[PDB]
């Protein structure tokens, strides 16, 4: 999971 890191992908 991800957990705090949704942005990841926001770059």
Known sequence: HXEGXF???FX
């Open 7 to 9: 942005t990841s992908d």
